[PDB]
Amino acid sequence: GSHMASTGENVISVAELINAMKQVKHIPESKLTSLAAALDENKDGKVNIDDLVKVIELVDKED
């Protein structure tokens, strides 16, 4: 249930997230929508902004 964005952070939608990254970046939208839908725990079309920041923080980690 209540597990994601427990930081108390805002929420954006999948389409707006893909759109934002589609216009503020030029990465393959396939990944954009897939990642948003993967972060979309409820599969509702809405994704926590926390998820974006945490996924970037996690992707930021070099290996």
Ligand SMILES: [Ca+2]
């Ligand atoms: Ca959701």
